[PDB]
Assembly symmetry: C3
Homo-oligomer: 31 residues x 3
């Protein structure tokens, strides 16, 4: 069960990194 939680956290972190990169692109586009 702890491994399943950790795997889900991995997925969340990867998505968060992707979101930050999307935001960086939006800031560049309007910069």
């Amino acid at each position: 069960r702890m491994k399943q939680i950790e795997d889900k956290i991995e997925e969340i972190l990867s998505k968060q990194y992707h979101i930050e990169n999307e935001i960086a692109r939006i800031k560049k586009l309007i910069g």
Copy 2:
């Protein structure tokens, strides 16, 4: 304790989905 962690992960995932939808709207607006 594991259930509390899992509930918090649920909240994080829901917010992440909301953020992705906000980003999609911003991209549409500037598209």
Copy 3:
């Protein structure tokens, strides 16, 4: 191990709050 998971969740929540604030700024800028 549960504490390490909880600490990571703390980091994720803080980053999510930061992302929401970045999005609010972008919405204000294009508003």
